Assembly symmetry: C2
Homo-oligomer: 264 residues x 2
């Protein structure tokens, strides 16, 4: 059975048994597993996902950037001094615990580079149960433009496979969740590549999983759609370091989704 | 619908049958799987204290009261005949563990005798305030996973984060556990966070809802497999009930004697 049915079964479950709040219908605690094996990329097909946005945003995080203008430059308006987002994902991943000044500050060697630490642990001690990258910083969350939805991610190694689990505190089943699946499925592919492992699974754990009430008629239309086979993902060239990836290095073959649906 | 303990039982079974073997099968070795989720109802006084093996209730409750106090002193537990934390600072000093991260996240750690009052982020009192003032908030998080403090701890925390949720006058909790020993660990962990939810529900005038247990590396120790096979032959019994005997104003004001665990009828303990 197609992995995308876990996502639809949850929307269906939320709209039918979920808790209405004042405007969302929500449930607490969910878990999906997406296979990343044999080049399979879980880019959801019942609605078109902004692939370029997914990839460019992740490359921006990997760079350590806290400057929204660097994304606006790539005609990505998902994150719209001016452009200064505070110590968000890119800063937490590369410089956890460092004092935040501004987006122009050179933070090289400041704080914990969790991304490089997780990569080193996968190579030197793959059986380690502490391969975690945490963006949820209780000290820095009030300094951030928006508090992180993606709290932490854990990685696991078995039979030459790299697996990743994301903890998402807040999940919009409409627009949010498909983009979130792709971001962390791409991160796994990138870390797998630099650590000489094959991608395994992407485990998506949700806290407050919800649908917006004004999106329900559109979700009813989307629930009527049959998932199509997922596209394939290839990294065109040998990338030595995680910071060395470019959008052009990714080869997304066979992405054939159903049309986009308006969810205001 | 079907006994909640069957989620825990089915997972042990699934791990021992299809799990991945790591390390030395002579002792330290494990059989593991990655990514799991259980849901335990806490409604109508139900307390999910596992019944196929007796769980150390007094250990669960005393350890949690010690975390709430913000203590990092293992001697305070030993004093209450709790030796769960027995296995270059002073004896009993565990470093910046759970108690510290919950009450003083971000504060620099010196020793277990240092007065940290007003230092760091009090996440436990923050979750209380948010539940009371804005129950619909999706940022009701208490994080013990501190990348900065993890190298200076005796043991890195297994219980990374927990999130709280409010709907229909019910408080639910979700725990993210990075490493879960299915044998001894996991039942104690279910009880610990179900008890925390009961305490927070009490001081915030809410009713307990669900305890959602999310796992990262879910594992059984190879030397515990014989004992787990014997446990799998056991049928779960109805869960006990939990009542808080008196009205407790603040989370720091609970005592072991305040808890009333009625009808806990487990199967005998198994050596692991």
């Amino acid at each position: 059975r197609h992995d995308e049915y876990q996502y639809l079964d949850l929307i269906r479950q939320i709209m039918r048994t979920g808790n209405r709040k004042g405007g969302t219908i929500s449930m607490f605690g969910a878990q999906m597993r997406y296979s990343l094996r044999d080049g399979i990329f879980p880019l959801l097909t019942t609605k078109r996902v902004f692939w370029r946005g997914v990839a460019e945003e992740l490359l921006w995080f990997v760079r350590g950037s806290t400057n929204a203008k660097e994304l606006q430059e790539k005609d990505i308006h998902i994150w719209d001094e001016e452009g200064d987002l505070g110590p968000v994902y890119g800063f937490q991943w590369r410089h956890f615990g460092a004092p935040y000044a501004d987006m122009h500050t050179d933070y090289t060697g400041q704080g914990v580079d969790q991304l490089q630490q997780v990569i080193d642990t996968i190579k030197n001690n793959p059986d380690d149960r502490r391969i975690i990258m945490c963006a949820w910083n209780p000290v820095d969350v009030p300094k951030m433009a928006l508090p992180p939805c993606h709290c932490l991610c854990q990685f696991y190694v078995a039979n030459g496979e790299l697996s990743c689990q994301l903890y998402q505190r807040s999940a919009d089943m409409g627009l949010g969740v498909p983009f979130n699946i792709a971001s962390y499925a791409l991160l796994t592919y990138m870390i797998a590549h630099v650590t000489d492992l094959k991608p395994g699974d992407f485990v998506h754990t949700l806290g407050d999983a919800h649908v917006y009430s004004n999106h329900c008629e559109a979700l009813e239309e989307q629930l009527k759609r049959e998932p199509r086979p997922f596209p394939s993902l290839k990294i065109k060239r040998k990338v030595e370091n995680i910071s060395d990836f470019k959008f052009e290095d990714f080869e997304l073959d066979g992405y054939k989704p159903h049309p986009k649906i308006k969810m205001e």
